[PDB]
């Protein structure tokens, strides 16, 4: 035959047995291993042995039988033997030499041969013949082999390599309308609202909202705006928790992004009185999905994944683990808080971890009451927190995401009526800050590590 | 032992080291092209054609893809202790050489792969298991990046790949978090002692983006990855002073970027404690003065900036572009040539401010910045509080449209005379009419500049 010729090299025969039957039934002439040729022929499907077209060698029990000149010339020449080259590789930690080389050869000779390495690319390769799609298949193959080899590299030296293939989420633009977006790797979420439109900014808002909500020590809810929390609550009553988080900074929460750490149900969904742009939860009842999707809320259900701080800078991807620090708080000065109040303090540090730095936050009775974030100085963060809290600061507790560099931020908080603060230590003026705490009668707890989050 | 298989593109680059190996008693085998090159330079080499059936299919394209060669690499008793392959540069796509290299790496306990001078020099010396494992990882890291480059030749942006780079970072964003840097960064650090931190690098990136395309000589000071102060003008010493003093309390520990050469005079003028200074170049006298301080000196090269982050295990990126298009006067009296310069300066700086951001500037310097806010009204409020009396007669920029007239009213009440912002609110009509009512001049920006 001079057309519809396919060379196959398969590790998983039984996956692809129904497909190869169809192919041969649709006039495809199949070439394969001496072994696979037999299987198929036993399975009633006619197939040709590539061994017949190259010299025979018995080196290393068959390890190099693909690595022959006639096979590669049959792919790389201007008049190739095969129109499609399909290779299904062993999974990690196996390292394949010949199969990978077959795929790359086919992609190299993309104007004459179509490579395929999975079900979707096989289907395209079988159907399509246009230049634009041939280039796409070639691109896809080298994208696949790049990722394949990154995985193998990391098997030898952990973290030596990073590699992704572009994913289509159908983003209309990036951060702003005049900017293009590129998403790399499949995201660990399901989109549950009708039509599934999602934006670049939605995804980054939802990441922070979700990290924080997952990071909450009990039933809780976080509202994000512009990638920083504007409100958060914890409690036992889901409808009330959500009401509290939303109303904490009521002016900002319109169009906000809500993440909860419990299943979103019909009662909670119907209780919403504020348009929210995105809702994120571990699960949604079907009834909740209907109510919310009908209200143009976008809905994300995350799976398990690791979060990372950092960005591209100077053409490098500069990444950091994102961790809420382990370690007990340590009373430094003042009367100890009651257990109830210490839980407010822990809650406050968990929320301030997610707040954009410099951040200072004030909370009481399981809800935030004033957040200052995104500030170039610690004193400014404290000031904004107190302004937003007003009289709600009286008797409240506060958290700072880094150490107080000077006593002034502490005076701002105490004058507002804050009774206790948590922060890391580490300043050259720690003694002076602690003495100011003592003077003002505010209780000071040392946090185990800083939680900058830019 | 001491057997090496060599396939070279950059022949002259490795001639000297190959001579050394042969003088040190290595037995050299080579691709036939490499084999004759070495011979014409007086180096004995064994042509691998010797151990395989001769063919010249497609004029030599497949000479390497022969079972005897791969069996000699992959078996438990290999023919070669080192496999050295240097690949053709882009846009060429290598099949046989990449396969040789990957085969050597696969059989890492028995064969040592190399692909450049660095890895060759290790492969020649070492035999320990840890170092053999490192050579294999390096090789697959290399072939991953090679193939990424090739993918993107076919479909732009379909692939992203990097090798890990050592920047000597002690930790990431906070001391209890690990840092990973991917790809060689387009900067040089000039400073003996303390290194640049994870946070310092991100601060410096925003400072530089903002300074680099100012409409004239300019300086930007950043704290916590957002501008705290900026200035443009005609006198380098004066520009830096103004930028530093604009929010003088916050500039302590700042990251200063200038779009001009850092010289002795400017260097001597700096009194404020700074973490980093970014400049396109530094004179030697400037480096001498500044080396008395702890401050890190960063000299950037050329590269593309990107917004975005990891989210849900995906890398989610956006272009970062200051938007092209002239501002359009919507209502009020047109500004003077000078004030319009102030207005563009203000929009360039608010592009780099964390959203929601509003800023006020006058006579080429920022006077108040409200940034990282959950609402636009709050941003405007902080900007005006910070500016105080300096907002009278000033200009303002907003990184996104005013959703209600209230934000515009806060600025007018402080004495701001003109604003630049995108339009696009359902209440654009009310916003514009409020600007008209208040006698504030409104220029429409071509596009939004959120920057979170
Ligand atoms: K934080
Ligand atoms: K901005």
Task: Quote the minimal CA–CA distance from B127 to chain A in Å.
Answer: 16
Task: Quote the minimal CA–CA distance from B258 to chain A in Å.
Answer: 16
Helix (H) or strand (E) holding A88: strand A84-88
Q: Do B67 and A72 touch (CB under 8 A)?
A: no
Rounded to an integer, what is the distance from CA A47 to the centroid of its chain? Answer: 44
Q: What is the Cα Rg of chain B in Å?
A: 30
- Select from A165, A175, A379 the Cβ nearest to the Cβ of B450: A175
A8 in Cβ contact with A40 (< 8 Å): no
- Experimental technique used to determine this entry: X-ray
Task: Determine the Cα–Cα distance for residues A322 and A304; give it in Å rounded to an integer.
Answer: 15
Partner A contacted by B68 (CB < 8 A): yes
Side-chain-side CA neighbours of B312 within 13 Å: the count stands at 26
Q: Is B446 left (phi over 0), alpha (psi -120 to 50) or beta?
A: alpha
Domain A1-158, CATH homologous superfamily name and number: Methylglyoxal synthase-like domain (3.40.50.1380)
Residue A324's nearest CA partner among B199, B174, B312, B200 is B174
A192 in Cβ contact with A281 (< 8 Å): no
Beta-bridge mates of residue A84:
A6, A114
Q: How far is the CA of A354 from the centre of ligand 1 (A)?
A: 5
Task: Determine the Cα–Cα distance for residues A216 and A259; give it in Å rounded to an integer.
Answer: 11
How far is the CA of A382 from the CAs of A333, A361, A395, in angstroms? 20, 8, 16
Task: Determine the Cα–Cα distance for residues B368 and B381; give it in Å rounded to an integer.
Answer: 10
Task: Determine the Cα–Cα distance for residues A77 and A22; give it in Å rounded to an integer.
Answer: 28
Token pair of B119, please?
């890895």
Return the CATH number of A328-454, one of 3.40.47.10, 3.90.1150.10, 2.120.10.30, 3.40.140.20: 3.40.140.20
Residue B213's nearest CA partner among B323, B316, B289, B314 is B323
B347 in Cβ contact with B236 (< 8 Å): no
**Three-state DSSP state, B241:** helix
Task: Determine the Cα–Cα distance for residues A225 and B372; give it in Å rounded to an integer.
Answer: 10
Task: Determine the Cα–Cα distance for residues A278 and A203; give it in Å rounded to an integer.
Answer: 9
Task: Determine the Cα–Cα distance for residues A223 and A242; give it in Å rounded to an integer.
Answer: 9
A86 in Cβ contact with A7 (< 8 Å): yes
Which residues in chain A are closer than 8 Å to B306, comparing Cβ atoms? 311-312
DSSP states along B179-204: EEEES--SEEEE-SSSPPPHHHHHHH
Which residues in chain B are closer than 8 Å to A56, comparing Cβ atoms? none
Task: Quote the minimal CA–CA distance from A129 to chain B in Å.
Answer: 16
Task: Determine the Cα–Cα distance for residues A155 and B106; give it in Å rounded to an integer.
Answer: 11
A422 in Cβ contact with A329 (< 8 Å): yes
Q: How far is the CA of A352 from the centre of ligand 1 (A)?
A: 5
**Three-state DSSP state, B153:** helix
Task: Determine the Cα–Cα distance for residues B62 and A143; give it in Å rounded to an integer.
Answer: 24
Q: Do A182 and B66 touch (CB under 8 A)?
A: no
Task: Determine the Cα–Cα distance for residues A380 and B337; give it in Å rounded to an integer.
Answer: 35
Partner B contacted by A100 (CB < 8 A): yes
List, as ranges, residues 299-338 from A with C-beta within 8 Å of B.
Answer: 302, 305-323, 325-326
DSSP states along A93-134: T---SHHHHHHHHHHHTTTT-EEE-SHHHHHHHHH---HHHH
Closest residue on chain A to B229 (Cα): A376
Beta-bridge mates of residue B359:
B369, B397
How many other β-carbons are positioned within 10 Å of the β-carbon of residue A124?
A: 17
Phi, psi (rounded to 5 degrees) for B415:
100, 10
Task: Determine the Cα–Cα distance for residues A334 and A439; give it in Å rounded to an integer.
Answer: 10
Phi, psi (rounded to 5 degrees) for A299:
-125, 125
Task: Determine the Cα–Cα distance for residues B258 and B250; give it in Å rounded to an integer.
Answer: 18
Which residues in chain A are closer than 8 Å to B275, comparing Cβ atoms? none
Task: Determine the Cα–Cα distance for residues B422 and B402; give it in Å rounded to an integer.
Answer: 8
Beta-bridge mates of residue A308:
A321
- Select from A55, A314, A376 the Cβ nearest to the Cβ of B185: A314
How far is the CA of A354 from the CAs of A300, B39, B223, in angstroms? 19, 65, 18
Strand B3-7 and strand A330-333: the pairing is: unpaired
The CATH architecture that domain B326-452 belongs to is 3-Layer(aba) Sandwich (3.40)
Proximal ligand: closest to the CA of B323: 2
A320 in Cβ contact with A399 (< 8 Å): no
Token pair of A170, please?
């159908």
Task: Determine the Cα–Cα distance for residues A13 and B190; give it in Å rounded to an integer.
Answer: 58
Token pair of B54, please?
């001769």
Partner A contacted by B404 (CB < 8 A): no
How far is the CA of A49 from the CAs of A31, A63, B362, in angstroms? 6, 16, 80
H helices of A183-338, where? 200-214, 238-248, 266-270, 286-294
- Select from A147, A159, A316 the Cβ nearest to the Cβ of B184: A316
Task: Determine the Cα–Cα distance for residues A135 and A152; give it in Å rounded to an integer.
Answer: 26
In the numeric block, the tokens 């400014």 are attached to A380
What does the DSSP 8-state code read for residue B364? T
Task: Determine the Cα–Cα distance for residues B230 and B240; give it in Å rounded to an integer.
Answer: 8
DSSP states along A298-363: EEEEE-----EEEEEETTEEEEEE--PPPS--EEEESSPPPHHHHHHHHHHHHHHHHSPSS-EEEE
Residue A250's nearest CA partner among A98, A386, A370, A92 is A370
Task: Determine the Cα–Cα distance for residues B102 and B85; give it in Å rounded to an integer.
Answer: 10
Closest residue on chain B to A137 (Cα): B154
Partner B contacted by A214 (CB < 8 A): no
State the distance between the two ends of chain B, measured CA to CA, in whole angstroms.
Answer: 58
B1-156: CATH topology: Rossmann fold (3.40.50)
Task: Determine the Cα–Cα distance for residues B32 and A5; give it in Å rounded to an integer.
Answer: 34
Q: So where are chain A's domains? A: 1-158, 188-304, 328-454
Closest residue on chain A to B298 (Cα): A314
B186-302: CATH topology: Cytidine Deaminase; domain 2 (3.40.140)
The CATH architecture that domain A188-304 belongs to is 3-Layer(aba) Sandwich (3.40)
Is the bond into A358 cis (omega within 30 degrees of 0)? yes
Partner A contacted by B91 (CB < 8 A): no
Task: Quote the minimal CA–CA distance from A162 to chain B in Å.
Answer: 5
B187 in Cβ contact with A314 (< 8 Å): yes
- Select from B67, B153, B356 the Cβ nearest to the Cβ of A68: B67
Residue B451's nearest CA partner among B312, B341, B347, B344 is B347
Residue B119's nearest CA partner among B140, B139, B95, B99 is B139
Q: What is the largest CA-CA distance in chain A?
A: 94
Residue B103's nearest CA partner among A101, A287, A186 is A101
**Three-state DSSP state, B227:** strand
Task: Determine the Cα–Cα distance for residues A272 and A269; give it in Å rounded to an integer.
Answer: 6
Same fold, A188-304 and A328-454: yes
Q: Do B317 and A183 touch (CB under 8 A)?
A: yes
Residue A156's nearest CA partner among B140, B85, B121, B84 is B140
Partner B contacted by A104 (CB < 8 A): yes
Residue B329's nearest CA partner among B199, B201, B441, B185 is B441
Task: Determine the Cα–Cα distance for residues B361 and B339; give it in Å rounded to an integer.
Answer: 10
Per-residue HEC secondary structure of B291-333 comes to: CCCCCEEEEECCCCCEEEEEECCEEEEEECCCCCCCCEEEECC
Task: Determine the Cα–Cα distance for residues A334 and A80; give it in Å rounded to an integer.
Answer: 83
What does the DSSP 8-state code read for residue B155? S
Task: Determine the Cα–Cα distance for residues B437 and B416; give it in Å rounded to an integer.
Answer: 14
- Select from B106, B172, B318 the Cβ nearest to the Cβ of A321: B172
Q: How far is the CA of B360 from the centre of ligand 2 (A)?
A: 14
Strands (E), B34-173: 46-47, 82-85, 112-114, 159-165
Task: Determine the Cα–Cα distance for residues B283 and B355; give it in Å rounded to an integer.
Answer: 36
A258 in Cβ contact with A280 (< 8 Å): yes
Task: Quote the minimal CA–CA distance from B451 to chain A in Å.
Answer: 7
What does the DSSP 8-state code read for residue A186? -
């Amino acid at each position: 035959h001079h057309m519809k010729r396919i060379l196959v090299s398969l590790y998983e025969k039984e996956k692809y047995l129904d497909i190869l039957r169809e192919l041969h039934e649709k006039g495809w002439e199949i070439w394969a291993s001496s072994g696979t040729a037999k299987f198929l022929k036993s399975n009633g499907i006619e197939a040709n042995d590539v061994s017949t077209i190259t010299g025979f060698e018995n080196l290393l029990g068959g390890l190099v039988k693909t690595l022959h000149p006639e096979i590669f010339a049959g792919i790389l020449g201007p008049e190739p033997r095969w129109d499609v080259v399909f290779v299904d590789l062993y999974p990690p930690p196996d390292i394949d030499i010949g199969g990978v080389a077959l795929l790359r050869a086919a992609a190299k000779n993309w104007k004459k041969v179509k490579p395929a390495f999975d079900m979707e690319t096989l289907k395209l390769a079988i159907e399509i013949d246009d230049e634009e799609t041939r280039k796409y298949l070639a691109g896809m193959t080298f994208a696949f082999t790049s990722v394949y080899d990154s995985i193998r590299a990391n098997q030898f030296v952990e973290g030596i390599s990073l590699a992704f293939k572009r994913e289509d989420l159908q983003l209309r633009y990036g951060e702003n309308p005049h900017e293009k977006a590129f998403v790399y790797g499949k995201p660990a979420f399901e989109i549950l609202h009708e039509g599934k439109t999602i934006s670049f900014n939605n995804i980054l808002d939802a990441e922070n909202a979700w990290f924080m909500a997952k990071n909450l020590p009990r039933m809780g809810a976080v509202v994000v705006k512009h990638q920083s929390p504007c409100g958060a609550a914890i409690g036992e009553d889901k409808v009330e928790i959500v009401k509290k988080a939303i109303e904490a900074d009521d002016e900002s929460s319109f169009g906000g992004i809500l993440a909860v750490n419990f299943e979103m149900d019909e009662e909670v969904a119907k209780s919403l009185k504020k348009y929210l742009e995105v809702i994120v939860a571990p699960s949604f009842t079907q009834e909740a999905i209907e109510v919310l999707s009908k209200k143009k809320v976008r809905l994300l259900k995350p799976g398990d994944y690791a979060s990372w701080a950092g960005k591209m800078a100077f053409g490098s991807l500069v990444l950091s683990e994102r961790k809420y620090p382990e370690g007990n708080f340590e009373l430094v000065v003042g009367e100890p808080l009651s257990e109830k109040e210490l839980e407010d303090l822990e809650f406050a540090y968990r929320v301030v971890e997610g707040a954009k730095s410099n951040a200072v936050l004030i909370a009481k009775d399981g809800v935030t009451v004033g957040i200052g974030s995104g500030q170039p100085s610690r004193k400014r963060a404290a000031w904004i927190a107190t302004v937003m809290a007003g009289e709600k600061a009286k008797g409240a507790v506060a958290a700072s995401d880094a150490f107080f560099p000077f006593p002034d931020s502490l005076e701002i908080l105490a004058q507002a009526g804050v009774k206790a603060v948590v922060a890391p230590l580490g300043s050259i003026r720690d003694e002076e800050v602690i003495e100011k705490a003592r003077e003002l009668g505010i209780t000071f707890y040392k946090a185990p590590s800083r939680v900058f989050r830019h």
